[PDB]
């Protein structure tokens, strides 16, 4: 029934504090109410401390807040092997101590930031140690994969080609939200050149609320977590769909809010609104899980979608007749009291697997080579319990992820 969550890496923790905020906010549980149902991991104390100093301070147990005073290191190796190792046990312990206390759970919603040290590496083995300790569950990892041109870390790809290959054979469904492609939404669909990280977080903090929160919440067309991976992954590769939200209108500027279904659903497939720089440049969808929430008439959907199924310029895979999982919830969304999110009475958090990422992975793989081609910051990992193996052998890994996402599509 439940779904634990492990927010790993400063980012996964910032986003965590955010997604965790939106929660109580739409459940009437102020600062000090019940008890969360997740944990927080980081090898840099000062960040988890922000959850220990700032807002939502006492809504957590100093037990579900793991820290390694030591060093973060923007390098996979160190975070996965060398350092990150020391903490893992302890980490697990909570996701085994928190996993017990419950009643027939469904899985762990993992929150990490692909291209980091504590986020890429660590998790790599966290999800790793999970796939074995609970192979019998769902492993949906919600990632924030590398901005297409606006990356931060100098190494980023090293850290992301490595978190992909190690987690690939362990996740159930990996959701992806592109940090940059979300900015566009903040520039083009909300207008603000002042987007603090605290915003992107409010956003995913939204799209995510549509996943677990409301879905695990009764409705006219419930959709379990398992449901996802089933209706969402055509193949064992921990396939990565993309998150998209519909009423991303500004709560100040424009106001046409009352945008009946027929509109908000069409607003999902236009590439300028998908929290991912993977513009459907060719990527044929192969399965979409349209999660609606608020006042929505099933016919409105079983029509708004029909209209789409016949737009053709939206070309769905061949081997897939119908790939539209319609998830209907009741309670409308719940916008921050005064952030910058419109606040409509219905939304569409549609996520999907698109042959599109054939790109995004490509463009991120290429990156890697360029540097590896010169070993660039390699000495930083080797000296951290890794080898020419793990790199070269994780490169070959993704290689067959560029062929995979190619074969499962583009062909009939």
């Amino acid at each position: 029934r439940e779904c634990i969550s492990i927010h790993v890496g400063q980012a996964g923790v910032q986003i965590g504090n955010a997604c965790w905020e939106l929660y109580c906010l739409e459940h009437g549980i102020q600062p000090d109410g019940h008890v969360p149902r997740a944990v927080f991991v980081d090898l840099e104390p000062t960040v988890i401390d922000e959850v220990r100093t700032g807002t939502y301070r006492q809504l957590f147990h100093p037990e579900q807040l793991i820290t390694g005073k030591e060093d973060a290191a923007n390098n996979y190796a160190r975070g996965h092997y060398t350092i990150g190792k020391e903490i893992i046990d302890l980490v697990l312990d909570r996701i085994r101590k928190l996993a017990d206390q419950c009643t027939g759970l469904q899985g762990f919603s993992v929150f990490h930031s692909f291209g980091g040290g504590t986020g890429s590496g660590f998790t790599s083995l966290l999800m790793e140690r999970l796939s074995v300790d609970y192979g019998k569950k769902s492993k949906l990892e919600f990632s924030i994969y590398p901005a297409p041109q606006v990356s931060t870390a100098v190494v980023e790809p090293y850290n992301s080609i490595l978190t992909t290959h190690t987690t690939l054979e362990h996740s159930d469904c990996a959701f992806m939200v592109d940090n940059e492609a979300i900015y566009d939404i903040c520039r083009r669909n909300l207008d603000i050149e002042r987007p603090t990280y605290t915003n992107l977080n409010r956003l995913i903090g939204q799209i995510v609320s549509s996943i677990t929160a409301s879905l695990r919440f009764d409705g006219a067309l419930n959709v379990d977590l398992t449901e996802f991976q089933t209706n969402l992954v055509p193949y064992p590769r921990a396939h990565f769909p993309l998150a998209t939200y519909a009423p991303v209108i500004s709560a100040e500027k424009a106001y046409h809010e009352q945008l009946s279904v027929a509109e908000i659903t069409n607003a999902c497939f236009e590439p300028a609104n998908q929290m991912v720089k993977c513009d459907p440049r060719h990527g044929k969808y192969m399965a979409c899980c349209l999660l609606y929430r608020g006042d929505v008439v099933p016919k409105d959907v079983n029509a708004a979608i029909a209209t789409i199924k016949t737009k053709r310029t939206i070309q769905f895979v061949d081997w897939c007749p119908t790939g539209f999982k319609v998830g209907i919830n009741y309670e409308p969304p719940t916008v921050v009291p005064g952030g910058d999110l419109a606040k409509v009475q219905r939304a569409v958090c549609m996520l999907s697997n698109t042959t599109a990422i054939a790109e995004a992975w490509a463009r991120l793989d290429h990156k890697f080579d360029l540097m590896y081609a010169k070993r660039a910051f390699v000495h930083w990992y080797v000296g951290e319990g890794m080898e020419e193996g793990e790199f070269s052998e994780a490169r070959e890994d993704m290689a067959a992820l560029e062929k995979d996402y190619e074969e499962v599509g583009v062909d009939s």
Binding site: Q10, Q14, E44, T46, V47, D49, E50, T53, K69, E70, D71, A72, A73, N74, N75, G117, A147, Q149, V150, S151, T152, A153, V154, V155, E156, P157, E180, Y183, C186, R187, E193, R194, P195, T196, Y197, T198, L200, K367, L370, M371, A373, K374, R375, A376, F377, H379, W380
Partner: protein
Amino acid sequence: REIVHIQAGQCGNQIGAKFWEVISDEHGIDPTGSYHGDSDLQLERINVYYNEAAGNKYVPRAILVDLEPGTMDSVRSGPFGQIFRPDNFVFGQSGAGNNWAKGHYTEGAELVDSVLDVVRKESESCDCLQGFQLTHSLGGGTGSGMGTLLISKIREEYPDRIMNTFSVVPSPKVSDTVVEPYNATLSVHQLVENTDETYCIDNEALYDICFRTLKLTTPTYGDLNHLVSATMSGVTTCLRFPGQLNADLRKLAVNMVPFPRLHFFMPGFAPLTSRGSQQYRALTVPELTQQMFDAKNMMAACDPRHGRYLTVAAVFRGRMSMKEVDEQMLNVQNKNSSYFVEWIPNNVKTAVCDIPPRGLKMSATFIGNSTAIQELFKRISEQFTAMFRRKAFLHWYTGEGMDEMEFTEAESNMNDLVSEYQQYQD
């Protein structure tokens, strides 16, 4: 986390006074007083530079190494001079001769053990050690020789903790000493092989940047020092503050050093406007990157425009949009694709603290790893040969128990170091 500063030589020392003059105020620590901190955040992370004893006396955890009493006895007899626990003063009343050899093999080699002693008392202080800060000048005895030894020993004692080095590489135009390239070439040698992050500053790159970027007409040393100390505060201490995207020595190290040499950077501060007038506030952000990335404004002597970059780290510290930050960096990376090296898709390492420099609204330290610094070790290396060839003031070295193969060694080494760096400019 933590670090333990090291004031090698007079310069490195003189600067200590300025690095601590600053940092303290950037942490509300009065002479011997405690934390008067205008805020409450300038305290949760202080440890990085102090120690708890009394309850109002957080003492800087640095080392003051020097073979010339008068110096430390000027730093200890002035302003903040009375905050260092006397135990910190590792003096060498000997003749602090201006010979690299006199402070690395003969005179300094003795005072070393009585230093390492303390560098251990401070390291084994508490919590977890990160690395050590090292200030000095590569143009003298107590600086290049004895300080370059202090590290060769440090890096044998904790090849784990990092080693940032702040070197005052011999300014071009005019040398404030004569053997300079001797004391220098010999210390850079030791650097390229122990510390793993070096920030090279040039007394004349400063003047310039201090007489034209600060209409300042009488730039006393105190100033130069002050400007420098401003950068080393943005680097370390800063990142030991919160931030949307914070880093720390390692991130800085693990994002800036593609190849083990250690490589040297060139620090640059952001708001560098003259007092009254200039106080233009054009600091939205494009103004800071405008600054940081220009030629002038690079504490180094060489000009970036004269050689690609391998890595860059804009360590900003003042509330800004992870969008207008992450964005700007890009155009910058495209307007100058020419010089920014290609085999690194994203050279730049954007870092973002929150709280800014006490009295300012928005700043951003720049730590550049450009291939341009090739054209400096060249300089140094040249000066050597031109004088080595004739063994100029060599008797002051050998006569101090040195080797004719020692000088050969260093030059070559550091000389090769020039070579390599070009391997990327191409």
